[PDB]
């Protein structure tokens, strides 16, 4: 059911997304062990993901949340990095994409920092790095992230280190 | 997959120590997220 539509780098939708990606890079306390050492990205491509059935599933659940939270879905756009990106774009997020040992419990995790999501592109802690060179800091291999629409509704606030 | 705290639909991880770190979020239902954009990229080696 999924189709991918390529955005032109001249489209403002491309530019608005690229800017979100670039401006939310930060330094990480691991000094780059998991995600690599970098201040910015070379964006090679941005594609819009279109799936009718996955969209209606999202919008149906978004209405339920909104109605339980003073008509406020509390919808954000957030980053997600994962070895499962290909399964996610075809079949949607489920319990298989959960971070079972995450600090806030076994769920699906999203970041405001693109660089934080980048730490999981090759697996937890960056795994063993890119498939071709076994390098968590590979400057050659192509990486993929998702920029997702996420319904937070009433969110439990957990302060943390 | 676990459940959200009773009365909540998600968790917000808010860094209290690092000022420069933005928030992280968790949902416990797959249908509360839609993967809109697929971004292909390389990280770049600093100068
Ligand atoms: C073997 C696949 O590993 C997972 O279960 C897994 C774990 C975490 C993530 C993931 C992906 C993220 O984008 C992310 C963002 C903020 C905080 C934590 C995050 O964690 C993706 C997949
Ligand atoms: Zn590589």
CATH of the domain at B22: 6.20.320.10
Taking an 8 Å cut-off on Cβ atoms, the answer to whether B30 and A45 are in contact is no
From chain A, the residues in CB contact with B16 under 8 A are 159-161
Cβ atoms A104, A152 nearer than 8 A: no
In angstroms, how far apart are the furthest CA atoms of chain B? 49
For residue A147, the enclosing domain spans: 1-161
In this structure, what DSSP letter does residue B4 have?
A: P
Q: Which residues, in sequence order, are bridge partners of residue B24?
A: A111, B13
Please, which residues have CB within 8 angstroms of residue A20's CB and are 6 or more apart in sequence? A77, A114, A147
Which residue CA neighbors atom 20 of ligand 1 most closely? Answer: A109
* CATH number of the domain that residue A112 is part of: 3.90.228.10
CA distance to A35, A70, A140, A161, per residue, from A135 (Å):
10, 47, 10, 28
Taking an 8 Å cut-off on Cβ atoms, the answer to whether A107 and B13 are in contact is no
Which residue CA neighbors atom 17 of ligand 1 most closely? Answer: A109
Q: Which of A28, A66, A50 is nearest to A151 (CA)?
A: A66
Which residue CA neighbors atom 7 of ligand 1 most closely? Answer: A99
Position of tokens 């954009």?
B37
* A12 vs A117: CA distance, rounded Å: 23
In ligand 1, the atom with minimum distance to the C-alpha of A117 is 13
Q: Which of A49, A47, A57 is nearest to A3 (CA)?
A: A49
Resolution in A, one decimal? 2.3
Q: What are phi and psi of A96, to 5 degrees?
A: -65, -20
* A13 vs A89: CA distance, rounded Å: 19
For residue B8, the enclosing domain spans: 1-47
Taking an 8 Å cut-off on Cβ atoms, the answer to whether A109 and B16 are in contact is no
CA distance to A12, A29, A60, A97, per residue, from A127 (Å):
35, 17, 35, 15
Q: What is the DSSP string of chain A?
A: --EEEEPPTTSHHHHHHHHHHHHT----TTTTTTT-S-S-EEEEEEEEEE-HHHHHHHHHHHHHHHHTTTT---EEEEEEE-TTHHHHHHH---GGG-BTT-TT-SBEEEESSHHHHHTTTTSGGGTT--TTT--TT-SSS-EEEEEEEEE-SSEEEEEE-
Q: What is the DSSP string of B5-41?
A: PTT-SEEEEEESS-TTPPPEEEES-GGGEEEEEEEEE
Cβ atoms A77, A112 nearer than 8 A: no
How many domains does chain B fold into? 1
Q: Which of B43, B27, B20 is nearest to A139 (CA)?
A: B43
Q: Is A130 annotated as a binding residue?
A: yes
How many domains does chain A fold into? 1
């Amino acid at each position: 059911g999924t189709i991918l539509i390529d955005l032109s780098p001249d489209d403002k939708e491309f530019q608005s997304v690229e800017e979100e990606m670039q401006s939310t890079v930060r330094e990480h306390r691991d000094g780059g062990h998991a995600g690599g050492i970098f201040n910015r990205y070379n964006i090679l491509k941005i594609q819009k993901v279109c799936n009718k059935k996955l969209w209606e599933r999202y919008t149906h659940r978004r209405k339920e949340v909104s109605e339980e939270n003073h008509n406020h879905a509390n919808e954000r756009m957030l980053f997600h990095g994962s070895p499962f990106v290909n399964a996610i774009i075809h079949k949607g997020f489920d319990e298989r994409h959960a971070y079972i040992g995450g600090m806030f419990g076994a769920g699906i995790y999203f970041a405001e920092n693109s660089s934080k999501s980048n730490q999981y592109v090759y697996g937890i802690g960056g795994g063993t790095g890119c498939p071709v060179h076994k390098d968590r800091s590979c400057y050659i291999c192509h990486r993929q992230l998702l920029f997702c629409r996420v319904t937070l509704g009433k969110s439990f606030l957990q302060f943390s280190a | 997959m676990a459940h959200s705290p009773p009365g909540h639909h998600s968790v917000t991880g808010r860094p209290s120590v690092n000022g420069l770190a933005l928030a992280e979020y968790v949902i416990y239902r797959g249908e509360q997220a839609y993967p809109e954009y697929l971004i292909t990229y390389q990280i770049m080696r600093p100068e």
